[PDB]
Amino acid sequence: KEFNNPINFQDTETRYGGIQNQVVNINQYVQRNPNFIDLDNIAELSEHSVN
């Protein structure tokens, strides 16, 4: 008939995730003389009508 949940559901399995190591410098120059960042102080507004 309709759905039921009597069967045990107690098993947990965990699989690790990793990234292979490489030289930290990696032919790259840290940062820039000028850094450009966009910051918004106004939260997005959504209009909903309820009657």
Partner: protein, 95 residues
């Protein structure tokens, strides 16, 4: 348009407001009504709810509750809560 009942209060089944905040607001409104009736000195209970929202949520909350009314408003994402308790519908949108 599909109304749903949660925690003893009828509100839109798809909740515009955040699940955490919406539950707190509904509980606070029910407690306020238990103390002050909507029929007598109804203006005072609405003012108390608005001040309460500012203390635990982002400021400039707008609260409108009436037995019969129709309104359309612009609100911030997850800042609109509409629910019905008994025959009274309470709608609050955070700006």
């Amino acid at each position: 348009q599909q109304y749903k009942t949660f925690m003893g209060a009828r509100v839109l089944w798809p909740p515009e407001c955040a699940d955490d905040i919406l539950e707190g607001a509904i509980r606070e409104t029910q407690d306020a009504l238990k103390k002050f009736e909507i029929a007598r000195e109804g203006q005072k209970i609405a003012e108390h709810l608005k001040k309460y929202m500012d203390d635990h949520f982002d400021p400039y909350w707008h609260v409108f509750f009436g037995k019969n009314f129709g309104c359309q408003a612009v609100h911030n994402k997850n800042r609109f809560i509409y629910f019905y308790i008994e025959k009274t519908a309470f709608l609050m949108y955070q700006t």
